[PDB]
Amino acid sequence: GPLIFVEKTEPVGYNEIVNIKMGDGTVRRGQVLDSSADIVVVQVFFTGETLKLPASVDLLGRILSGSGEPRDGGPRIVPDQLLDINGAAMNPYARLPPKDFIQTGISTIDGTNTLVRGQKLPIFSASGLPHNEIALQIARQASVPGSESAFAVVFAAMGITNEEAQYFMSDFEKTGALERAVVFLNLADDPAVERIVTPRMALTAAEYLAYEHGMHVLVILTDITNYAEALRQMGAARNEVPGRRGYPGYMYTDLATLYERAGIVKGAKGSVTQIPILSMPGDDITHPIPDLSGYITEGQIVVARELHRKGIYPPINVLPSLSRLMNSGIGAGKTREDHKAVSDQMYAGYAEGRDLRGLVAIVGKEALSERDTKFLEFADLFEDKFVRQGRNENRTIEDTLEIGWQILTHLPENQLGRIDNKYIQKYHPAH
Amino acid sequence: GPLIFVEKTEPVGYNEIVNIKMGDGTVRRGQVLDSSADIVVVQVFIFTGETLKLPASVDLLGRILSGSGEPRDGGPRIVPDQLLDINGAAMNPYARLPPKDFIQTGISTIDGTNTLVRGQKLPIFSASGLPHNEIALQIARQASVPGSESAFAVVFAAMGITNEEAQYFMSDFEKTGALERAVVFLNLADDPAVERIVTPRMALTAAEYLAYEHGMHVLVILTDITNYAEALRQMGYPGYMYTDLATLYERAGIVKGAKGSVTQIPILSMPGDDITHPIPDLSGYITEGQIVVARELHRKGIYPPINVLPSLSRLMNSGIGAGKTREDHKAVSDQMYAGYAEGRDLRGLVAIVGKEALSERDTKFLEFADLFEDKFVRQGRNENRTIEDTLEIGWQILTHLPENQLGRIDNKYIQKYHPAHRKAK
């Protein structure tokens, strides 16, 4: 059945039968699938012990490898608890829906596609686009305004270059973001099995901090596509083809062992939220991977080459973007009462303005009506002032709504069909 | 600068500065970018040219034409009621009205959970080696507007296809009678690239004519926008592409008078090899949701392999309920969605703790996900399900869940429609 991860203490052969002492004290029998120098991947039905996260609140402030070993020149973590990493430890999750606001500081998320505590909200991108910049910005900026619970970030990078690792380390250290974060960095040339354990070490640390320490924890995982590229060559998957005889059953459910691990935790003081990065694979023909669409259930944030080529950062197109749980994190007592109306109106005006870019190409700028011209112009204002923000610019939701209201003044007040008159009088810059 | 298509009536040269006559007697100025023997491509910013025109008639219905509108079915050239500028500028048929009311595709994973509405643009988002063209043809055969006083038509446009694909599409339309209510435009890979980029314009112009001048609900199916983008590239992708795409996606909606409409289903298929075919940003087309074709379901032998969880229709609520589908539609959709999401997360949990470690309640949701895939998602290639059929399959599989776990369904609908409570009439 399940895949588990084991401390290596001697060479093992493929399909070798082993006995494993679990974190809970019980014993399983299983078969070896693959190994690195220090880790064995075992499929459960030599005696070893499971690979463990050294769990402590002092994980915060540390930069570690995919297997949890120091990368920051500091001493190894002193454990409060030693936890199995596959998801079986703690049974932390409540049967409660995600809710309440996480302020990322980025208007195209907070404003129009709000991230909620306990949600999984992927960044959907492609090669050459600045998804890692967005991920690092959220790591530096995120908070839970008004919460009685402490906030932490777990940032996990998979298959990255030495240059990228050095950059991420420097960024966490210089900004002071490191103080509230645990960072796991897996390099391209680190063992494939270490890459596979990376998101499990990260999620286990997040669950520990959320459940045992009552924290709201935000987990940023980049790039799930790179995780999958290592998966698809590990163990029983090696040179097997998806949808064909010989392809192992566990390959169909592996991604779900990652995306199941999010939500409000028992007690409802804490939560685990995921922002996985999914880069569109450009090599489906030569490197088939597990379907990534399972990770996309609660919405997505879409990174658009059009906006990148216009020189806009962050190049997020709000129109194909969605948060499914947005309504659970906004409004009076969370953000502000006018949030939903303003988001609705900006979305509608921007979609109209973008269609009108097509109409301009069809009939010519001077053939466009006065009213249409205002919506055309609104789409430019939306991109130039609302979408566009600095790499270092952390906007409160109040800042975001204020920019929204300012650009909305470009539209005729009588064209604001999605904003009730109560909000126009209370919030419109002209009133 | 944007592209405008001009009838070749006099010889032109590259970079030649020209005027183009618009439908109202005005002219726009541009520069010749490229040309085939019969079609000039002008970038808008002396020869005065005429716009390229569609020969428009109700007799378009039942015909198979090339990307340029020439016959491909051995029949006579179209005898026009009128000659319509295909660039979209001589006639603005669209009303300032939101899309509304139901289009039945006969496919449960569309009608049930992510309903298509009249005037919407709802892309099929897919990838190399997936059966998006099977899904496209099945919608072309099955689609309808139940109860509408307006007649229904289909416009099917294919771009950069093989001879083998072309013969298959033609044969399918002819054999099923699907052709009789359709205008079919087929552009082959080897046809001039200029005809490939004219193809969706010819298609959208025919749809606007039928919708507006004949009071019809028209469904336009376009396959594959990635091949369209490749033709722009052959003429990364050109910077003007994003605006150019907008000239296609702007052309949808309810028409003036509200007795007709143009609905689009474009196929957006991600390339299988970005070295030779880079991944285009076609996200401009995705503003009202998408239907996601997924590898997991395909690998498992399920057709149509549509994953409802990442799929969306943003306008679904405008096409469902009493007098459109049935009063319980939103409730059943919400519940199936929630139940399937939970069952799929529980497949993850099984792969963490083992199947026998799952609770009895969790096991019911796990089983529900299998029932959803096997009974609801899976349907025959030629199986045309009414919305009632789709909802009743929904109710049947929902009985597998504990009744007190149906949190998204109003008690009034449980009492009226749940198989354990419903009374025989």
mmCIF file of N, CA, C and O in Angstrom, chain A residues 2 86-88 95 120 242-243 253 256-257 259-260 280 282-285 289-291 293 297 304-306 309 317 319-321 324 347 352 354-355 358 360-364 371-372, chain B residues 2 28 87-89 96 121 125 237 239 242 246-247 249-250 270 272-274 279 281 283-284 286-287 294-296 299 307 309 311-312 314 337 342 344-345 348 351-352 354 361-362:
data_model
loop_
_atom_site.group_PDB
_atom_site.id
_atom_site.type_symbol
_atom_site.label_atom_id
_atom_site.label_comp_id
_atom_site.label_asym_id
_atom_site.label_seq_id
_atom_site.Cartn_x
_atom_site.Cartn_y
_atom_site.Cartn_z
ATOM 1 N N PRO A 2 0.820 2.009 1.139
ATOM 2 C CA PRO A 2 1.441 3.330 1.172
ATOM 3 C C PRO A 2 2.964 3.319 1.029
ATOM 4 O O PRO A 2 3.627 2.380 1.467
ATOM 5 N N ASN A 86 5.329 10.973 6.191
ATOM 6 C CA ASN A 86 4.454 10.661 5.056
ATOM 7 C C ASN A 86 3.031 11.201 5.170
ATOM 8 O O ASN A 86 2.250 11.070 4.221
ATOM 9 N N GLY A 87 2.687 11.773 6.326
ATOM 10 C CA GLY A 87 1.339 12.299 6.562
ATOM 11 C C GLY A 87 0.578 11.575 7.665
ATOM 12 O O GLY A 87 -0.438 12.082 8.146
ATOM 13 N N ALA A 88 1.067 10.401 8.064
ATOM 14 C CA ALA A 88 0.412 9.597 9.106
ATOM 15 C C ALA A 88 0.531 10.187 10.511
ATOM 16 O O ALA A 88 -0.354 9.969 11.342
ATOM 17 N N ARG A 95 -12.579 18.525 10.231
ATOM 18 C CA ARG A 95 -13.561 18.420 9.161
ATOM 19 C C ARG A 95 -14.329 19.747 9.136
ATOM 20 O O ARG A 95 -15.547 19.798 9.377
ATOM 21 N N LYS A 120 -5.726 25.403 -0.655
ATOM 22 C CA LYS A 120 -4.601 25.166 -1.560
ATOM 23 C C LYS A 120 -4.869 25.954 -2.837
ATOM 24 O O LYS A 120 -5.838 25.671 -3.570
ATOM 25 N N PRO A 242 2.772 5.768 -18.213
ATOM 26 C CA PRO A 242 1.431 5.953 -17.643
ATOM 27 C C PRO A 242 0.317 5.397 -18.537
ATOM 28 O O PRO A 242 0.364 5.543 -19.766
ATOM 29 N N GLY A 243 -0.657 4.737 -17.914
ATOM 30 C CA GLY A 243 -1.774 4.132 -18.643
ATOM 31 C C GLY A 243 -1.439 2.777 -19.243
ATOM 32 O O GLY A 243 -2.263 2.184 -19.946
ATOM 33 N N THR A 253 -1.828 7.969 -7.293
ATOM 34 C CA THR A 253 -2.286 8.586 -6.053
ATOM 35 C C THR A 253 -1.217 9.407 -5.316
ATOM 36 O O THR A 253 -1.522 10.064 -4.295
ATOM 37 N N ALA A 256 -1.865 13.141 -4.753
ATOM 38 C CA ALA A 256 -2.921 13.326 -3.764
ATOM 39 C C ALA A 256 -2.422 13.232 -2.329
ATOM 40 O O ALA A 256 -3.032 13.803 -1.427
ATOM 41 N N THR A 257 -1.301 12.535 -2.110
ATOM 42 C CA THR A 257 -0.745 12.486 -0.748
ATOM 43 C C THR A 257 -0.144 13.839 -0.362
ATOM 44 O O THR A 257 0.068 14.109 0.836
ATOM 45 N N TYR A 259 -1.563 16.967 -1.943
ATOM 46 C CA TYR A 259 -2.667 17.930 -1.915
ATOM 47 C C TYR A 259 -3.754 17.682 -0.860
ATOM 48 O O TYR A 259 -4.499 18.614 -0.502
ATOM 49 N N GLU A 260 -3.810 16.465 -0.323
ATOM 50 C CA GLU A 260 -4.711 16.166 0.810
ATOM 51 C C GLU A 260 -4.274 16.883 2.081
ATOM 52 O O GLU A 260 -5.090 17.101 2.981
ATOM 53 N N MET A 280 3.748 24.757 -16.415
ATOM 54 C CA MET A 280 3.213 23.945 -17.500
ATOM 55 C C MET A 280 4.388 23.182 -18.069
ATOM 56 O O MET A 280 5.387 23.796 -18.441
ATOM 57 N N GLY A 282 6.545 21.562 -20.809
ATOM 58 C CA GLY A 282 6.714 21.718 -22.249
ATOM 59 C C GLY A 282 7.217 20.457 -22.924
ATOM 60 O O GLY A 282 7.539 20.486 -24.117
ATOM 61 N N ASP A 283 7.283 19.354 -22.172
ATOM 62 C CA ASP A 283 7.800 18.088 -22.702
ATOM 63 C C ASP A 283 6.909 16.861 -22.433
ATOM 64 O O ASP A 283 7.412 15.778 -22.108
ATOM 65 N N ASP A 284 5.591 17.018 -22.593
ATOM 66 C CA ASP A 284 4.652 15.905 -22.367
ATOM 67 C C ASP A 284 4.986 14.671 -23.193
ATOM 68 O O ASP A 284 4.769 13.552 -22.754
ATOM 69 N N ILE A 285 5.500 14.889 -24.400
ATOM 70 C CA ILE A 285 5.749 13.788 -25.327
ATOM 71 C C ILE A 285 6.927 12.912 -24.861
ATOM 72 O O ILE A 285 6.850 11.680 -24.894
ATOM 73 N N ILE A 289 4.397 12.804 -17.103
ATOM 74 C CA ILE A 289 4.331 12.871 -15.645
ATOM 75 C C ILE A 289 2.905 12.605 -15.154
ATOM 76 O O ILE A 289 1.959 12.639 -15.953
ATOM 77 N N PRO A 290 2.745 12.313 -13.852
ATOM 78 C CA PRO A 290 1.398 12.274 -13.277
ATOM 79 C C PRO A 290 0.634 13.556 -13.579
ATOM 80 O O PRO A 290 1.228 14.645 -13.635
ATOM 81 N N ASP A 291 -0.673 13.407 -13.779
ATOM 82 C CA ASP A 291 -1.575 14.533 -14.035
ATOM 83 C C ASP A 291 -1.517 15.500 -12.869
ATOM 84 O O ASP A 291 -1.705 15.087 -11.716
ATOM 85 N N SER A 293 -3.510 18.110 -12.567
ATOM 86 C CA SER A 293 -4.802 18.798 -12.439
ATOM 87 C C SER A 293 -5.514 18.552 -11.108
ATOM 88 O O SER A 293 -6.317 19.389 -10.687
ATOM 89 N N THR A 297 -8.081 22.134 -7.553
ATOM 90 C CA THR A 297 -9.475 22.105 -7.137
ATOM 91 C C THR A 297 -10.050 23.417 -6.583
ATOM 92 O O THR A 297 -11.164 23.784 -6.948
ATOM 93 N N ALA A 304 0.812 35.120 -16.740
ATOM 94 C CA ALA A 304 0.529 35.313 -18.162
ATOM 95 C C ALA A 304 1.703 35.973 -18.892
ATOM 96 O O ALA A 304 2.101 37.095 -18.564
ATOM 97 N N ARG A 305 2.219 35.290 -19.913
ATOM 98 C CA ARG A 305 3.324 35.821 -20.725
ATOM 99 C C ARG A 305 2.968 37.164 -21.377
ATOM 100 O O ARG A 305 3.851 38.004 -21.552
ATOM 101 N N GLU A 306 1.694 37.376 -21.731
ATOM 102 C CA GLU A 306 1.279 38.650 -22.320
ATOM 103 C C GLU A 306 1.684 39.812 -21.408
ATOM 104 O O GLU A 306 2.249 40.807 -21.857
ATOM 105 N N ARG A 309 5.504 40.254 -21.103
ATOM 106 C CA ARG A 309 6.094 40.902 -22.285
ATOM 107 C C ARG A 309 5.779 42.393 -22.372
ATOM 108 O O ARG A 309 6.521 43.149 -23.017
ATOM 109 N N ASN A 317 -2.756 37.395 -14.653
ATOM 110 C CA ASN A 317 -4.034 37.705 -15.325
ATOM 111 C C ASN A 317 -5.193 37.272 -14.447
ATOM 112 O O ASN A 317 -5.396 36.086 -14.224
ATOM 113 N N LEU A 319 -8.370 37.344 -14.897
ATOM 114 C CA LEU A 319 -9.595 36.790 -15.526
ATOM 115 C C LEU A 319 -9.684 35.237 -15.521
ATOM 116 O O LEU A 319 -10.760 34.694 -15.197
ATOM 117 N N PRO A 320 -8.605 34.527 -15.917
ATOM 118 C CA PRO A 320 -8.618 33.063 -15.750
ATOM 119 C C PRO A 320 -8.290 32.602 -14.332
ATOM 120 O O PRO A 320 -8.436 31.421 -14.018
ATOM 121 N N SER A 321 -7.857 33.527 -13.476
ATOM 122 C CA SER A 321 -7.562 33.188 -12.077
ATOM 123 C C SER A 321 -8.864 33.039 -11.273
ATOM 124 O O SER A 321 -9.889 33.621 -11.635
ATOM 125 N N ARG A 324 -11.781 29.692 -5.279
ATOM 126 C CA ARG A 324 -13.087 29.106 -4.980
ATOM 127 C C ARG A 324 -13.613 29.453 -3.593
ATOM 128 O O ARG A 324 -14.824 29.459 -3.386
ATOM 129 N N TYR A 347 -13.325 43.152 -11.937
ATOM 130 C CA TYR A 347 -13.298 41.980 -12.808
ATOM 131 C C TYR A 347 -14.149 42.240 -14.061
ATOM 132 O O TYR A 347 -13.688 42.006 -15.204
ATOM 133 N N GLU A 352 -14.471 43.504 -19.839
ATOM 134 C CA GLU A 352 -15.065 44.324 -20.901
ATOM 135 C C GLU A 352 -13.993 45.105 -21.660
ATOM 136 O O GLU A 352 -13.961 45.074 -22.897
ATOM 137 N N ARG A 354 -10.830 44.465 -21.969
ATOM 138 C CA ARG A 354 -10.004 43.547 -22.767
ATOM 139 C C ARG A 354 -10.696 43.100 -24.064
ATOM 140 O O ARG A 354 -10.045 43.024 -25.110
ATOM 141 N N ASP A 355 -12.012 42.863 -24.000
ATOM 142 C CA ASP A 355 -12.768 42.544 -25.232
ATOM 143 C C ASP A 355 -12.743 43.758 -26.156
ATOM 144 O O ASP A 355 -12.631 43.613 -27.372
ATOM 145 N N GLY A 358 -10.026 44.078 -28.637
ATOM 146 C CA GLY A 358 -10.416 43.404 -29.874
ATOM 147 C C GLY A 358 -11.280 44.275 -30.771
ATOM 148 O O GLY A 358 -11.046 44.372 -31.984
ATOM 149 N N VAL A 360 -11.458 47.556 -30.850
ATOM 150 C CA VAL A 360 -10.568 48.615 -31.395
ATOM 151 C C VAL A 360 -9.809 48.122 -32.617
ATOM 152 O O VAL A 360 -9.706 48.837 -33.621
ATOM 153 N N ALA A 361 -9.287 46.899 -32.546
ATOM 154 C CA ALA A 361 -8.580 46.329 -33.689
ATOM 155 C C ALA A 361 -9.533 46.114 -34.872
ATOM 156 O O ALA A 361 -9.137 46.313 -36.020
ATOM 157 N N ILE A 362 -10.787 45.757 -34.591
ATOM 158 C CA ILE A 362 -11.808 45.535 -35.636
ATOM 159 C C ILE A 362 -12.293 46.831 -36.338
ATOM 160 O O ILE A 362 -12.355 46.872 -37.578
ATOM 161 N N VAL A 363 -12.617 47.874 -35.561
ATOM 162 C CA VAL A 363 -13.268 49.083 -36.117
ATOM 163 C C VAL A 363 -12.384 50.336 -36.124
ATOM 164 O O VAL A 363 -12.691 51.320 -36.815
ATOM 165 N N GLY A 364 -11.299 50.314 -35.360
ATOM 166 C CA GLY A 364 -10.454 51.494 -35.197
ATOM 167 C C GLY A 364 -10.816 52.276 -33.951
ATOM 168 O O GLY A 364 -11.983 52.330 -33.557
ATOM 169 N N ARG A 371 -18.442 55.730 -24.125
ATOM 170 C CA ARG A 371 -18.573 54.801 -23.005
ATOM 171 C C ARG A 371 -17.585 53.641 -23.136
ATOM 172 O O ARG A 371 -16.903 53.301 -22.164
ATOM 173 N N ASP A 372 -17.484 53.056 -24.331
ATOM 174 C CA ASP A 372 -16.533 51.943 -24.558
ATOM 175 C C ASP A 372 -15.081 52.391 -24.356
ATOM 176 O O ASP A 372 -14.265 51.643 -23.809
ATOM 177 N N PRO B 2 -2.919 45.771 -35.931
ATOM 178 C CA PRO B 2 -3.885 44.687 -36.123
ATOM 179 C C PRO B 2 -4.031 44.250 -37.575
ATOM 180 O O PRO B 2 -3.751 45.025 -38.491
ATOM 181 N N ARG B 28 -9.852 52.945 -43.709
ATOM 182 C CA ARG B 28 -8.722 52.836 -42.786
ATOM 183 C C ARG B 28 -7.448 52.665 -43.623
ATOM 184 O O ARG B 28 -7.500 52.142 -44.734
ATOM 185 N N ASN B 87 -14.045 40.655 -41.265
ATOM 186 C CA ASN B 87 -13.212 41.233 -40.204
ATOM 187 C C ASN B 87 -14.040 41.629 -38.989
ATOM 188 O O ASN B 87 -13.482 41.898 -37.923
ATOM 189 N N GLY B 88 -15.360 41.646 -39.172
ATOM 190 C CA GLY B 88 -16.315 41.871 -38.083
ATOM 191 C C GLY B 88 -16.837 43.288 -37.938
ATOM 192 O O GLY B 88 -17.630 43.551 -37.027
ATOM 193 N N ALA B 89 -16.428 44.173 -38.854
ATOM 194 C CA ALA B 89 -16.606 45.633 -38.726
ATOM 195 C C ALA B 89 -17.777 46.250 -39.483
ATOM 196 O O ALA B 89 -18.153 47.398 -39.201
ATOM 197 N N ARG B 96 -25.852 44.735 -25.559
ATOM 198 C CA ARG B 96 -25.253 44.932 -24.241
ATOM 199 C C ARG B 96 -26.038 44.117 -23.212
ATOM 200 O O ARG B 96 -26.774 44.676 -22.381
ATOM 201 N N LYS B 121 -18.421 32.211 -23.953
ATOM 202 C CA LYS B 121 -17.241 31.564 -24.535
ATOM 203 C C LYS B 121 -16.701 30.606 -23.476
ATOM 204 O O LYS B 121 -16.307 31.049 -22.401
ATOM 205 N N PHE B 125 -9.921 23.132 -22.560
ATOM 206 C CA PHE B 125 -8.499 23.234 -22.286
ATOM 207 C C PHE B 125 -7.928 21.824 -22.249
ATOM 208 O O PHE B 125 -8.343 21.024 -21.422
ATOM 209 N N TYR B 237 6.042 33.715 -30.002
ATOM 210 C CA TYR B 237 4.937 34.252 -30.799
ATOM 211 C C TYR B 237 5.029 35.764 -30.973
ATOM 212 O O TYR B 237 5.600 36.447 -30.120
ATOM 213 N N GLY B 239 4.396 39.724 -30.913
ATOM 214 C CA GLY B 239 3.840 40.573 -29.865
ATOM 215 C C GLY B 239 2.393 40.991 -30.081
ATOM 216 O O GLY B 239 1.652 41.157 -29.110
ATOM 217 N N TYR B 242 -1.618 38.901 -28.884
ATOM 218 C CA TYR B 242 -2.601 38.992 -27.788
ATOM 219 C C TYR B 242 -3.810 39.856 -28.181
ATOM 220 O O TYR B 242 -4.954 39.468 -27.944
ATOM 221 N N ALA B 246 -7.922 38.774 -29.276
ATOM 222 C CA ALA B 246 -9.089 39.528 -28.775
ATOM 223 C C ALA B 246 -10.113 39.825 -29.871
ATOM 224 O O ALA B 246 -11.308 39.968 -29.595
ATOM 225 N N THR B 247 -9.646 39.908 -31.118
ATOM 226 C CA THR B 247 -10.585 40.118 -32.239
ATOM 227 C C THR B 247 -11.442 38.862 -32.480
ATOM 228 O O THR B 247 -12.497 38.933 -33.130
ATOM 229 N N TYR B 249 -12.104 36.549 -29.588
ATOM 230 C CA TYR B 249 -12.916 36.350 -28.385
ATOM 231 C C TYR B 249 -13.921 37.473 -28.076
ATOM 232 O O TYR B 249 -14.865 37.243 -27.323
ATOM 233 N N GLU B 250 -13.758 38.644 -28.697
ATOM 234 C CA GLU B 250 -14.784 39.700 -28.578
ATOM 235 C C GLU B 250 -16.096 39.318 -29.294
ATOM 236 O O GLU B 250 -17.175 39.832 -28.958
ATOM 237 N N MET B 270 -2.442 22.436 -25.266
ATOM 238 C CA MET B 270 -1.043 22.691 -24.962
ATOM 239 C C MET B 270 -0.142 21.772 -25.801
ATOM 240 O O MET B 270 -0.419 20.573 -25.946
ATOM 241 N N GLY B 272 2.879 19.409 -27.142
ATOM 242 C CA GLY B 272 3.600 18.310 -26.495
ATOM 243 C C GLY B 272 5.112 18.455 -26.486
ATOM 244 O O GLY B 272 5.801 17.682 -25.810
ATOM 245 N N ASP B 273 5.626 19.430 -27.236
ATOM 246 C CA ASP B 273 7.075 19.661 -27.370
ATOM 247 C C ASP B 273 7.320 21.147 -27.590
ATOM 248 O O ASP B 273 7.209 21.635 -28.722
ATOM 249 N N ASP B 274 7.665 21.865 -26.521
ATOM 250 C CA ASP B 274 7.824 23.322 -26.610
ATOM 251 C C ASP B 274 9.097 23.800 -27.320
ATOM 252 O O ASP B 274 9.240 24.990 -27.609
ATOM 253 N N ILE B 279 4.837 27.041 -25.939
ATOM 254 C CA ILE B 279 3.537 27.174 -25.266
ATOM 255 C C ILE B 279 3.041 28.615 -25.404
ATOM 256 O O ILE B 279 3.677 29.531 -24.880
ATOM 257 N N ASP B 281 0.525 31.879 -24.757
ATOM 258 C CA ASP B 281 -0.379 32.423 -23.748
ATOM 259 C C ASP B 281 -1.699 32.759 -24.427
ATOM 260 O O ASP B 281 -1.855 33.829 -25.034
ATOM 261 N N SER B 283 -4.484 32.843 -22.609
ATOM 262 C CA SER B 283 -5.343 33.067 -21.437
ATOM 263 C C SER B 283 -6.366 34.179 -21.669
ATOM 264 O O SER B 283 -7.356 34.274 -20.949
ATOM 265 N N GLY B 284 -6.146 35.015 -22.680
ATOM 266 C CA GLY B 284 -7.141 36.025 -23.044
ATOM 267 C C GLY B 284 -8.505 35.423 -23.363
ATOM 268 O O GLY B 284 -9.540 36.083 -23.205
ATOM 269 N N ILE B 286 -9.890 32.966 -21.818
ATOM 270 C CA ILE B 286 -10.407 32.261 -20.629
ATOM 271 C C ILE B 286 -10.937 33.254 -19.594
ATOM 272 O O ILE B 286 -10.307 33.506 -18.563
ATOM 273 N N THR B 287 -12.124 33.796 -19.854
ATOM 274 C CA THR B 287 -12.724 34.804 -18.978
ATOM 275 C C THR B 287 -14.083 34.411 -18.364
ATOM 276 O O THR B 287 -14.615 35.113 -17.478
ATOM 277 N N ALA B 294 -8.340 15.923 -19.105
ATOM 278 C CA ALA B 294 -7.288 15.554 -18.143
ATOM 279 C C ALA B 294 -6.650 14.194 -18.454
ATOM 280 O O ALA B 294 -7.340 13.220 -18.771
ATOM 281 N N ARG B 295 -5.328 14.119 -18.306
ATOM 282 C CA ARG B 295 -4.603 12.873 -18.599
ATOM 283 C C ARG B 295 -4.944 11.712 -17.662
ATOM 284 O O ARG B 295 -5.009 10.580 -18.106
ATOM 285 N N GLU B 296 -5.152 11.973 -16.375
ATOM 286 C CA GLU B 296 -5.468 10.881 -15.438
ATOM 287 C C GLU B 296 -6.676 10.055 -15.904
ATOM 288 O O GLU B 296 -6.626 8.825 -15.950
ATOM 289 N N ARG B 299 -5.839 8.103 -19.184
ATOM 290 C CA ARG B 299 -4.961 6.973 -18.864
ATOM 291 C C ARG B 299 -5.723 5.810 -18.239
ATOM 292 O O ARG B 299 -5.353 4.646 -18.439
ATOM 293 N N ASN B 307 -12.133 16.451 -16.256
ATOM 294 C CA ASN B 307 -12.035 16.594 -14.814
ATOM 295 C C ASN B 307 -12.851 17.800 -14.384
ATOM 296 O O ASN B 307 -12.483 18.938 -14.690
ATOM 297 N N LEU B 309 -13.285 19.129 -11.423
ATOM 298 C CA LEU B 309 -12.811 19.930 -10.299
ATOM 299 C C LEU B 309 -12.066 21.227 -10.702
ATOM 300 O O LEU B 309 -12.330 22.267 -10.118
ATOM 301 N N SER B 311 -12.481 22.415 -13.742
ATOM 302 C CA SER B 311 -13.400 23.053 -14.709
ATOM 303 C C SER B 311 -14.327 24.069 -14.013
ATOM 304 O O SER B 311 -14.605 23.956 -12.815
ATOM 305 N N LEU B 312 -14.848 25.034 -14.780
ATOM 306 C CA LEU B 312 -15.656 26.164 -14.238
ATOM 307 C C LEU B 312 -16.527 26.545 -15.413
ATOM 308 O O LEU B 312 -15.979 26.816 -16.475
ATOM 309 N N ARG B 314 -18.435 30.219 -15.369
ATOM 310 C CA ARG B 314 -18.717 31.383 -14.516
ATOM 311 C C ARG B 314 -20.149 31.860 -14.646
ATOM 312 O O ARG B 314 -20.664 32.553 -13.754
ATOM 313 N N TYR B 337 -19.989 17.960 -6.790
ATOM 314 C CA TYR B 337 -18.665 18.606 -6.797
ATOM 315 C C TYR B 337 -17.950 18.396 -5.449
ATOM 316 O O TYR B 337 -16.806 17.909 -5.408
ATOM 317 N N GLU B 342 -13.922 15.605 -2.078
ATOM 318 C CA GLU B 342 -13.607 14.924 -0.827
ATOM 319 C C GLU B 342 -13.096 13.506 -1.104
ATOM 320 O O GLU B 342 -12.062 13.090 -0.564
ATOM 321 N N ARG B 344 -11.665 12.380 -3.773
ATOM 322 C CA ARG B 344 -10.333 12.431 -4.380
ATOM 323 C C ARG B 344 -9.225 12.734 -3.351
ATOM 324 O O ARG B 344 -8.134 12.168 -3.434
ATOM 325 N N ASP B 345 -9.495 13.623 -2.387
ATOM 326 C CA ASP B 345 -8.520 13.838 -1.308
ATOM 327 C C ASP B 345 -8.334 12.541 -0.521
ATOM 328 O O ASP B 345 -7.218 12.221 -0.080
ATOM 329 N N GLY B 348 -5.736 10.192 -1.632
ATOM 330 C CA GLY B 348 -4.472 10.595 -1.012
ATOM 331 C C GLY B 348 -4.328 9.982 0.368
ATOM 332 O O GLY B 348 -3.274 9.400 0.697
ATOM 333 N N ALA B 351 -3.424 6.448 0.409
ATOM 334 C CA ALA B 351 -2.025 6.259 0.021
ATOM 335 C C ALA B 351 -1.044 6.710 1.107
ATOM 336 O O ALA B 351 0.176 6.578 0.932
ATOM 337 N N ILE B 352 -1.578 7.246 2.210
ATOM 338 C CA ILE B 352 -0.807 7.621 3.401
ATOM 339 C C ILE B 352 -0.946 6.576 4.528
ATOM 340 O O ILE B 352 0.058 6.086 5.047
ATOM 341 N N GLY B 354 -3.299 3.708 4.440
ATOM 342 C CA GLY B 354 -3.784 2.412 3.969
ATOM 343 C C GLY B 354 -5.302 2.394 3.941
ATOM 344 O O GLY B 354 -5.952 3.042 4.782
ATOM 345 N N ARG B 361 -17.432 6.215 7.112
ATOM 346 C CA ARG B 361 -17.913 7.423 6.435
ATOM 347 C C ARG B 361 -16.974 7.817 5.291
ATOM 348 O O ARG B 361 -17.424 8.096 4.175
ATOM 349 N N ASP B 362 -15.675 7.850 5.575
ATOM 350 C CA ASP B 362 -14.692 8.222 4.544
ATOM 351 C C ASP B 362 -14.712 7.222 3.388
ATOM 352 O O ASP B 362 -14.572 7.607 2.213
#
